[PDB]
Design an enzyme around this catalytic site. Structure first.
Site, PDB file in Angstrom:
ATOM      1  N   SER A   8      -2.676   2.101   5.695  1.00  0.00           N
ATOM      2  CA  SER A   8      -2.091   1.657   4.436  1.00  0.00           C
ATOM      3  C   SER A   8      -2.459   0.201   4.202  1.00  0.00           C
ATOM      4  O   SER A   8      -2.519  -0.583   5.148  1.00  0.00           O
ATOM      5  CB  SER A   8      -0.573   1.802   4.481  1.00  0.00           C
ATOM      6  OG  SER A   8      -0.202   3.155   4.678  1.00  0.00           O
ATOM      7  N   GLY A  23       0.791  -1.233   0.000  1.00  0.00           N
ATOM      8  CA  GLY A  23       0.000   0.000   0.000  1.00  0.00           C
ATOM      9  C   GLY A  23       0.821   1.279   0.000  1.00  0.00           C
ATOM     10  O   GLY A  23       2.050   1.242   0.084  1.00  0.00           O
ATOM     11  N   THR A  24       0.128   2.415  -0.080  1.00  0.00           N
ATOM     12  CA  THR A  24       0.783   3.728  -0.126  1.00  0.00           C
ATOM     13  C   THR A  24       1.266   4.136   1.267  1.00  0.00           C
ATOM     14  O   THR A  24       0.832   3.571   2.270  1.00  0.00           O
ATOM     15  CB  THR A  24      -0.146   4.833  -0.686  1.00  0.00           C
ATOM     16  OG1 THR A  24      -1.142   5.178   0.284  1.00  0.00           O
ATOM     17  CG2 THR A  24      -0.828   4.391  -1.982  1.00  0.00           C
ATOM     18  N   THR A  25       2.159   5.122   1.323  1.00  0.00           N
ATOM     19  CA  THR A  25       2.776   5.527   2.588  1.00  0.00           C
ATOM     20  C   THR A  25       1.837   6.404   3.420  1.00  0.00           C
ATOM     21  O   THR A  25       1.175   7.296   2.889  1.00  0.00           O
ATOM     22  CB  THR A  25       4.103   6.286   2.363  1.00  0.00           C
ATOM     23  OG1 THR A  25       4.901   5.593   1.396  1.00  0.00           O
ATOM     24  CG2 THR A  25       4.888   6.404   3.671  1.00  0.00           C
TER      25      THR A  25
END
Ligand SMILES: [Cl-]
Lengths: 243, 241, 240, 231, 235, 244, 195, 250, 111
Positions: free
Chosen positions: A74, A29-31
């Site tokens: 995330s 996932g994204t930060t």
């Protein structure tokens, strides 16, 4: 073998491979980050702009629980929303019975026990999210990070997602350089810098920054999104540091 | 071989899921130790905070179950907190139903019975934890009772748990061979804490700062944990002798 | 509650549990139904690997559902009791609400519906039973014979057989039964039924059961000697 | 492979294959397009038949006077989800005398789909949805995926060969977003968008399906001779 | 094994796809819609000559204005018909009117996906639902165990379907009379059937606005069969 | 989910047999033999205890022969624990009938209901069947003396003489040989013991490895008496027929 | 409802039951048969609350007929009466109890004896030589205490019954429109048409 | 969520064995030896107290348990399984007997209730069988003294004397040589201690041995006086000191 | 004891012509001897050219109108936007009312 095919099954090591597999979904996932400050907490997240067609500012990822707690995560986004929906139910029933808004440590264990419960049976799947959350209560500021296993701790700073190591390194410098404490307005700026620095690990698509904060002095102890002038000021501070 | 995935018997009459839950116990790489004084029961546990970003005050494996009962856990924190919340709820209900504080050994039995159920019922996994309960019981006096994923439980003169448990166990055995008694013959809990730390140092062969340890003390009518400065005060006393 | 979907489709579009239930029927003792001009006759094989039986008390192969309808079967005996019981209860329930006994078609339709329900309900296996249901509708003299099977399908037959070696006796009935002229009397119908079982049975001793149903609740079971006379008469005409 | 037997199982890389297989059903579905300006939102859908003797499977469903969607994938699942939206819109009206915000509609669909991805026995929904609406904050377009992910967009497309229309809309963004107070032009842009996803077949009169909602326009669907204007 | 509601890697439900194979093994059923009415015809297909063919009931009345033909595991259809009849009569009780053919079909198709781990498996039978209402006139629907229904001008289901459907593609036009449709169903059934078509192993039916749903006598169909053979020999 | 670990106890084999029923019968074939013989003036029940130890308390013991009511008894072959579950159900059922109709339950009715319970465990619920076969011995005023047997499938049949458990094939042949219809109880007692003595897997048949019972009208006038034999009485009847 | 009588003699049980069905100030019917045949040799008459009576009677009838088909056997009058008593004994503690009083006349074929049972809505069962429910008993019991003998013939029982109906027609306030009389003996159940 | 295991975990194998019951008996075989001997005026049940650590207080772990005032139990196999069985057994003596008849159940019937509980773990959904064999000794007015063995299957057998667990085969043979029908309670205690020494390896004293009797009524252990009919429990646990006294005259 | 009903007064009137129909009602709303509102409408357009009034206890009146309006909405959703004829509306309202047979809507309804 086959120990990894079913949730709640111990491997010969003593591990639950299904939870470890959920962690892989989180790492994908994204930060997202959390910074604890003098009298509050600051949350920030990377929003990958997949296409020009995405309406800016209109796919909000940070979520509020009650009026004083903020949550960001995330990994599998729907899983995160399920966790917050539960969080809101837990916070509502606490306030109903005890009148006072739910303390952050109390709220942290409510999520913790619920996520831990999804590692006890083979008929449910573990959560595919690590959740950074916190706020201000009667004992001041608290920041937490909760993982698929149900494990959580209090943090000075917290990070998760694809750029977690980059963000962690940057968080450790702030802790070392500011032993007395970081101010709320400073932490907002730093959060912007760290998301931009952590974006190097996801640099194909460019992104949209989203920040929120709770502060005893700056937001009166309530969760608010950082918008407009304060957001653009924080974006500019970050842009100056990468160059 | 699905007899290794759920809690049914293997051909040799074993429960592998219970056995593997025992191995999860050491996953934290932390050693705990419990001893009894005349007036008190002291439990100590290692405190390892590897990440600099952690708030060290929130890292704990010792729990205050009731006013009189304390519990230290060896195992992963999610299962540890699961056990703690249930123990707190059980101790609270007992007091409401029966009009007196739940004894340490009764709570131990109850938590052990719950653990036993998970070894017999298929849909529930065992918790990968070993629970050490401590108190100064109003009838039995200083008490240490320990629970494991098999649902086994027993009272102890003293005990240790963790990866290097055997070293600590024999160290304690050898002391009680020498002293010829069931406890630490000491007046103040302060010196029983000092004894506990001293004998952990000898057995593990490591020195401790104030942040490498975690101490719980049970006295009559209250169980409490020590602050970093309470432990530092205790570490200074050991060094000056 | 136990929920497992035991009857499910396979890649080729078969429900194996229903088809394996048919194999249980194929294992069961042979049962035959033949309807005449004014009657229906139900004949049933009884295997002779069981001597020392008590025939007074042993469950009979043909069961009365009401005073005017009968049910025989092939397959699992224990399974058939559940179907018979349900049918008998529905028979009394119908008389209670409609103020008229069941038609043979209706009673058959109910029994078939029960069988079907056990092919797409969770936690249950299909009935290992096929049935022959015969009788006369209230105030009607036209003979009725129906057949059901584990899948739930049912249909009307001039004559039909089920169970082991039923394909052999069906062969016999297919060339020996004239649709234009069904067995005009009771004697003719019983004889054709006994003849068809003698193609498969063995000895015509205590191996064959015969039950005759006539209009207006006139049902009687033949005794050994009565059946044995048909066996004796058929064999003497055969030596030609 | 060994981790696609049910939705409750993660793969070693952290994937949910049953959810991905549900996503695959959408890809096989007939193309549908969504786009909006500041005054109107428009759905355009290519309908699919079994053969020349059959009708053309309807792709667009009305949810309220101010909201509705188009579907790609399993149609019965779209019927279940649209029915749920109809009830949620309705609850908001009866209880609060309030038109359900298109954003909340998205959040509700996300959470309904999610529950089917974390429990044993269930299955993910096998359909993608494009929700359009006009509420107190103007025109909206949402994209629903049965993974649970709901996304607000200026324009988009789902189904087979949807990438053509999605690229076109990405180029046309600055043009169609400013088609304010002109329904027929916003539709034309959507009909041109869906044309970038056609192969061997072209838009006929019983093939094309268009929907529109906006400032002074209730959610209304056009089929048959009413879409002949746009071919 | 595996879940009953499992998706294949191609995005299809295994059990629904497998039930479609069961329907291909079923006896042929054909429906043709005209402006004078809708005709429903089926192959009876008796498994043995001793079986009384008139007890084979594969064409069925749902209401006076709605009829239904079936193909596949026909025992599975009983509860579908029972639901359809109740839905139709219930709507008349609640609204003092006839229920729309499409609304009926949608109600039946709602049952279809109500399986899993609700019933244990999908239905193994496809339905042709034919009827008339004041709004949309004469209609023919094909209802599948997937929960999907298509409206058709003409449609064949069962073992001889793909061949019969190709034949229906050529023969159907928007000006067919009822009599023309009747003969066309007989003609196409005779082509795809195994045994030789007659009044005992095939059944016709129709629904008209005036007289409602009617299953034809064996005498009436026999004359249409004779009329058909004479017309094919006549050129 | 849990599907992985489901044995599916209530399914058909490709041949149309019920796996679990067949395997339960295989289990029962290793249990001690039990014999029932019906005479014109009574019924005999005889059963062999499973390999005994000398320190077993023989008199206060019950393993094979159980009383259902004053007119009906059963001989057990299989898992005892399973049998007691079913026996208690049967006992309650008999009392329900008596409470409802004020008449003792007809033997077949009780046998049917117990057999119907067994049937249920083979068709629904996903549980293992009861690993038990019964020989029912009883009397009622409709059919007089009756023998029945039921097995895990829930199928029951009536008999003049019958065996269950081990060596039924050999036991049945021997019973079929020497049984005749005008037989008396005392003759049946002898046949029962003679059959067990020849079919036993033990070296010699002794009193401590047997349970024995009779159901006679040998009370006083038109009423039935159940006699569960005491150890010493089995020792005497074994001597009286010259087996020991 | 209202009048139901029963007399057990040497070889038969005779049940007499009033023909009137009155609601308000209107006699709605004068040919009502307040009886059901439970089995070939068992007859049950009934009186009580409207609706409840027939509903209960037919429910019992269905159960006994179900039993008969299952076992291919006829329950004894004693067994049937005990089943009926238990149903009423259950009923009295239900949310809405059956308000029905019954007489059961049967011929036990195993004993070759007539039997008459009186059961009220509470589930109070008694075997009697003669029985009555409701206000009828207040006249007939004393009358039968005087004229009844245990060894009477069916004909004598009918004359004894005529004497009861005559007394009720003289002293009862309501017009019950005569009775339907039925005899239960070794040959089953038959109705006397001229009474 | 919820227990989805509604199906049997113990099923018949093609050979006819019930696997989980067999494997449970295997667990009992591994268990420490326990025994029971029936005398004319009492019963003795005994076992070794296998200590898990010398720091453990083995007094806090009771292998021999009182079920009713006249019934006691001991086991071989899995301790935790035994512990919960004792809880259930104590309760069922009240719920299904004492609360109905106002008196304690006779040994055979309490045993029967425990056996039922163990049988159900062999057939019910989503459970394994209990991994223990029980020896239950008791007394009641109309049956006198009795001794029963309850196996994981749910089967129970009455015994004059027997042993279960580790060295049961040798211990049973030892008991066969020594048992007669004239043994007095003190003679049975003596034989119990002799038989146990064969299977015990380390220390053999009153702290490593657990032993209880079913004998005479103990009015001193009743806790009250004034009711003549109430005379005190027949179950008594021998003290550590009482065992050592008998180990000198061994 | 709590009385769940009240009387809000007012009166309504419906007349039908050859190609039209009127439904009239006063706008006064009362409890006891007090006026609550001089203008509170109780005649409503429910769509599909159906006008409806449920006069008596206003809380029940509003609840019924609310439910019928909703019924018209779902009739469209379920039957391809088909117009709800007045005879069908009448039959639908019967079921709305009779559904609360044992706790009635305290209103005289006219459409
Ligand atoms: Cl407990």
């Amino acid at each position: 073998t086959g120990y990894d095919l079913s949730n709640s099954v111990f491997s010969p090591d003593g591990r639950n491979f299904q939870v470890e597999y959920a962690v892989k979904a989180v790492e994908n996932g994204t930060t997202s980050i959390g910074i604890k400050c003098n009298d509050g907490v600051v949350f920030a997240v990377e929003k990958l702009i997949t296409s020009k067609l995405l309406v800016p500012q209109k796919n909000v990822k940070i979520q509020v629980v009650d009026r004083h707690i903020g949550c960001v995560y995330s990994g599998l986004i729907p899983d995160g929303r399920h966790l917050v929906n539960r969080g809101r139910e837990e916070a509502a029933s606490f306030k109903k019975l005890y009148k006072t808004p739910i303390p952050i440590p109390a709220f942290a264990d409510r999520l913790g026990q619920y996520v831990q419960a999804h590692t006890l049976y083979n008929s449910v799947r573990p959560f595919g999210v690590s959740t950074i959350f916190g706020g201000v209560d009667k004992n001041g500021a608290h920041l937490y990070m909760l993982e698929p296993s149900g494990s959580y701790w209090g943090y000075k700073g917290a990070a998760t997602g694809k750029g977690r190591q980059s963000a962690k390194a940057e968080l450790e410098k702030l802790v070392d350089h500011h032993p007395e404490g970081l101010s709320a307005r400073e932490a907002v700026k730093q959060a912007a810098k760290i998301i931009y620095l952590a974006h190097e690990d996801n640099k194909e698509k460019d992104f949209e920054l989203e920040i929120s904060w709770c502060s005893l002095s700056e937001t009166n102890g309530l969760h608010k999104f950082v918008k407009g002038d304060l957001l653009q000021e924080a974006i500019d501070f970050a842009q100056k540091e990468i160059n | 071989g699905y007899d290794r995935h759920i809690t049914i018997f293997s051909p040799e009459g074993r429960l592998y899921q219970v056995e593997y839950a025992f191995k999860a116990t050491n996953q934290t790489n932390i050693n705990s130790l419990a001893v009894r004084g005349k007036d008190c029961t002291v439990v100590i546990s290692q405190k390892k905070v590897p990440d600099k970003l952690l708030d060290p005050t929130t890292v704990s494996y010792i729990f205050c179950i009731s006013r009189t009962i304390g519990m230290v856990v060896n195992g992963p924190i999610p299962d540890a907190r699961n056990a703690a919340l249930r123990a707190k709820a059980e101790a609270a209900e007992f007091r409401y139903k029966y009009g007196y504080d739940m004894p340490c050994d009764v709570l131990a039995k109850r938590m052990a019975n719950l653990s036993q159920i998970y070894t017999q019922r298929a849909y529930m996994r065992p918790l990968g934890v070993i629970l050490t309960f401590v108190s100064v019981d109003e009838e039995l006096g200083p008490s240490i009772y320990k629970t494991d994923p098999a649902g086994y439980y027993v009272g102890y003169k003293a005990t240790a748990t963790g990866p290097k448990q055997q070293e600590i166990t024999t160290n304690l055995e050898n002391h009680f061979k020498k002293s010829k008694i069931d406890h630490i013959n000491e007046e103040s809990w302060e010196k029983v804490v000092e004894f506990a730390i001293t004998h952990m140092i000898d057995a593990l062969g490591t020195e401790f700062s104030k942040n490498d340890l975690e101490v719980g003390v049970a006295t009559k009518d209250k169980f409490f944990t020590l602050s970093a400065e309470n432990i530092e005060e205790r570490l200074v006393a050991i060094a000056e002798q | 509650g136990y929920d497992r979907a035991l009857s499910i489709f396979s890649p080729d579009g078969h429900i194996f549990q229903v088809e394996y239930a048919l194999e249980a029927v194929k294992r069961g003792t042979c049962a035959v139904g033949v309807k005449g001009k004014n009657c229906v006759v139900l004949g049933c094989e009884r295997r002779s690997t069981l001597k020392l039986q008590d025939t007074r008390i042993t469950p009979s192969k043909v069961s009365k559902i009401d005073s005017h309808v009968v049910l025989s079967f092939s397959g699992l005996n224990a399974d058939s009791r559940i179907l018979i019981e349900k049918a008998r209860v529905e028979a009394q329930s119908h008389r209670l609400t409609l103020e008229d006994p069941v038609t043979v078609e209706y009673l058959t339709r109910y029994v078939a519906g029960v069988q079907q329900r056990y092919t797409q309900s969770g936690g249950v296996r299909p009935f290992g039973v096929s049935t022959l249901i015969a009788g006369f509708d209230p105030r009607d003299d036209e003979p009725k014979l129906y057949q059901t099977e584990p899948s739930g399908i049912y249909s009307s037959w001039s004559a039909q057989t089920i169970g082991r070696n039923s394909k052999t006796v069906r062969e016999f009935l297919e060339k020996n039964y004239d649709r234009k002229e069904p067995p005009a009397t009771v004697e003719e119908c019983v004889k054709l039924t006994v003849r068809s079982l003698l193609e498969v049975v063995q000895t015509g001793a205590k191996n064959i059961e015969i039950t005759v149903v006539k209009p207006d609740s006139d049902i009687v079971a033949l005794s050994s000697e009565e059946i044995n006379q048909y066996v004796t008469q058929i064999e003497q005409e055969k030596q030609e | 492979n060994n981790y696609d037997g049910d939705t409750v199982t993660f793969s070693p890389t952290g994937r949910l294959f049953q959810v991905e297989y549900a996503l695959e059903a959408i890809k096989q579905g007939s193309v549908t397009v969504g786009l909006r300006s500041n005054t109107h939102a428009v759905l355009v859908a290519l309908k699919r038949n079994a053969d020349e003797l059959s009708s053309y499977q309807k792709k667009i469903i009305k949810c309220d006077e101010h909201m509705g969607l188009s579907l790609a994938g399993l149609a019965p699942d779209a019927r279940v989800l649209s029915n749920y939206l109809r009830q949620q819109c309705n609850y908001s009206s009866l209880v609060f005398n309030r038109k359900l915000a298109v954003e909340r509609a998205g959040h509700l669909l996300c959470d309904k789909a999610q529950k089917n991805t974390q429990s044993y026995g269930g299955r993910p929904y096998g359909v993608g949805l494009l929700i359009i609406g006009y509420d107190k904050s103007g025109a909206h377009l949402l994209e629903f995926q049965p993974s649970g992910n709901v996304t607000e967009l200026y324009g988009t497309a789902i189904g087979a060969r949807s990438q053509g229309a999605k690229t076109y809309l990405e180029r046309t963004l600055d043009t169609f977003i400013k088609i304010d107070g002109n329904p027929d032009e916003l539709i034309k842009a959507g009909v041109e968008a869906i044309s970038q996803s056609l192969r061997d077949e072209s838009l006929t009169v019983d093939n094309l399906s268009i929907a529109i909602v906006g400032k002074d326009t209730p959610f209304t669907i056009y089929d048959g001779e009413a879409v002949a204007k746009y071919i | 094994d595996r879940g009953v509601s499992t998706f294949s890697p191609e995005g299809r439900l295994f059990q629904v796809e497998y039930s479609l194979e069961a329907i291909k093994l079923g006896s042929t059923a054909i429906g043709i819609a005209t402006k004078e009415g809708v005709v429903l015809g089926v192959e009876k297909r008796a498994t043995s000559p001793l079986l009384e063919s008139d007890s084979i009931e594969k064409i069925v009345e749902i209401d006076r204005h709605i009829g239904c033909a079936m193909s596949g595991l026909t025992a599975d259809a009983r509860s579908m018909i029972e639901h359809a009849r109740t839905a139709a009569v219930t709507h008349n009780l609640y609204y003092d009117e006839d229920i729309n053919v499409e609304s009926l079909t949608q109600s039946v198709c709602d049952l279809a996906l109500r399986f899993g781990e609700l019933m244990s498996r999908p239905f193994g039978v496809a339905l042709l639902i034919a009827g008339h209402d004041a709004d949309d006139g004469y209609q023919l629907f094909h209802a599948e165990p997937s929960g999907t229904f298509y409206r058709y001008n003409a449609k064949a289901i069962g073992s001889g379907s793909e061949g019969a459907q190709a034949e229906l593609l050529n023969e159907w036009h928007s000006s067919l009379t009822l009599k023309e449709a009747e003969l066309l169903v007989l003609k196409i059934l005779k082509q795809v059937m195994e045994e030789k078509l007659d009044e005992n192993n095939a059944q016709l039916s129709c629904i008209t606005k005036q007289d409602g749903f009617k299953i034809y006598d064996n005498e009436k169909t026999a004359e249409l069969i004779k009329e058909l053979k004479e017309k094919e020999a006549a050129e | 989910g849990s599907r992985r670990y489901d044995s599916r106890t209530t399914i058909f084999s490709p041949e149309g047999r019920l796996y679990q029923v067949e395997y339960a019968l295989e289990s029962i074939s290793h249990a001690g033999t039990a014999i029932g013989i019906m005479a014109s003036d009574g019924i005999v029940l005889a059963a062999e205890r499973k390999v005994t130890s000398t320190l077993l308390e023989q008199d206060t013991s019950t393993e094979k022969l159980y009383k259902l009511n004053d007119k009906i008894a059963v001989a057990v072959a299989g898992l005892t624990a399973d049998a007691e579950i079913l026996i208690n159900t049967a006992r309650i059922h008999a009392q329900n009938y008596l409470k409802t109709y004020n008449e003792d339950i007809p033997v077949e009715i009780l046998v049917r209901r117990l057999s119907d319970i067994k049937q249920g465990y083979t068709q629904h619920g996903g549980l293992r069947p009861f690993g038990v076969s019964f020989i029912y011995a009883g009397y009622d005023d409709r059919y007089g003396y009756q023998l029945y047997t039921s097995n895990p499938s829930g199928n029951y049949t009536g008999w003049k003489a019958i065996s269950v458990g081990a060596n039924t094939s050999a036991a049945q042949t021997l019973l079929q040989m020497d049984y005749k219809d005008d037989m008396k109880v005392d003759d049946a007692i002898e046949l029962a013991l003679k059959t067990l003595s020849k079919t036993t897997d033990s070296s010699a048949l002794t009193y401590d490895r047997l349970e024995f019972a009779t159901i006679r009208k040998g009370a006083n006038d038109g009423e039935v008496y159940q006699k569960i034999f005491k150890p010493q009485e089995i020792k005497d009847i074994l001597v009286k027929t010259g087996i020991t | 409802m209202d009048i139901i009588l029963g007399i057990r003699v040497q070889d038969s049980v005779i049940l007499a039951s009033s023909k009137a069905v009155t609601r308000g100030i209107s006699v709605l019917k004068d040919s009502d048969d307040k009886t059901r045949q439970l089995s070939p040799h068992t007859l049950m008459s009934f009186a009580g609350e409207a609706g409840d009576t027939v509903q209960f009677a037919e429910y019992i009838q269905a159960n006994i007929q179900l039993y008969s088909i299952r076992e291919d056997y006829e329950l004894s009058p004693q067994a049937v009466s005990s089943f009926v008593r238990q149903e009423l004994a259950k009923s009295i503690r239900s949310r809405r109890p059956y308000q029905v009083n019954v007489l059961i006349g049967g011929y036990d074929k195993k004993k070759n004896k007539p039997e008459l049972y009186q059961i009220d809505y509470l589930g109070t069962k008694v075997e009697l030589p003669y029985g009555a429910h409701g206000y009828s008993g207040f006249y007939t019991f004393s009358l039968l205490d005087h004229h009844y003998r245990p060894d009477m013939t069916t004909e004598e029982g009918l004359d004894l019954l005529k004497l009861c109906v005559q007394e009720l027609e003289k002293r009862m306030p309501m017009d019950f429109k005569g009775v339907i009389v039925k005899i239960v003996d070794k040959d089953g159940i038959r109705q006397v048409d001229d009474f | 969520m919820t227990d989805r295991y509604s199906f049997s975990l113990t099923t018949f194998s093609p050979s006819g064995k019930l696997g989980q019951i067999d494997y449970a008996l295997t667990a009992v075989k591994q268990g420490v030896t326990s025994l029971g001997i029936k005398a004319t005026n009492g019963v003795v049940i005994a076992t070794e107290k296998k200590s898990s650590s010398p720091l453990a207080m083995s007094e806090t772990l009771s292998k021999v348990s009182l079920l009713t005032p006249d019934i006691g139990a001991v086991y071989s196999g899995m301790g935790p399984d035994y512990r919960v069985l004792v809880d259930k057994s104590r309760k069922v003596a009240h719920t299904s007997y004492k609360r109905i008849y106002g008196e304690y159940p006779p040994t055979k019937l309490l045993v029967s209730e425990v056996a039922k509980i163990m049988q159900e773990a062999t057939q019910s959904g989503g459970v394994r069988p209990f991994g223990v064999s029980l020896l239950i000794a008791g007394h009641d007015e109309f049956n006198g003294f009795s001794l029963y063995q309850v196996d994981p299957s749910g089967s129970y057998f009455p015994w004059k004397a027997t042993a279960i667990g580790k060295g049961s085969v040798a211990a049973k043979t030892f008991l066969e040589k020594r048992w007669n029908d004239e043994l007095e309670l003190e003679d049975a205690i003596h034989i119990a201690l002799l038989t146990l020494k064969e299977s015990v390896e380390g220390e053999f004293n009153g702290d490593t041995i657990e032993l209880a009797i079913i004998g005479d009524e103990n009015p001193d252990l009743l806790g009250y006086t004034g009711i003549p009919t109430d005379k005190g429990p027949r179950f008594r646990k021998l003290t550590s000191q009482e065992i050592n006294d008998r180990l000198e005259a061994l | 004891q709590f009385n769940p009903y009240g009387d809000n007064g007012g009166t309504i009137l419906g007349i039908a012509g050859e190609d039209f129909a009127v439904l009239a009602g006063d706008t006064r709303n009362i409890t006891d001897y007090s006026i609550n509102s001089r203008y509170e409408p109780k005649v409503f357009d429910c769509g599909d050219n159906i006008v409806m009034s449920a006069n008596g206890f206003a809380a029940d009146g509003d609840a019924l109108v609310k439910r019928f309006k909703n019924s018209v909405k779902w009739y469209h959703f379920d039957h391809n936007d088909k117009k709800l004829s007045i005879n069908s509306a009448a039959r639908n309202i019967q079921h709305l009312l009779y559904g609360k047979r044992f706790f009635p809507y305290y209103v005289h309804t006219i459409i």
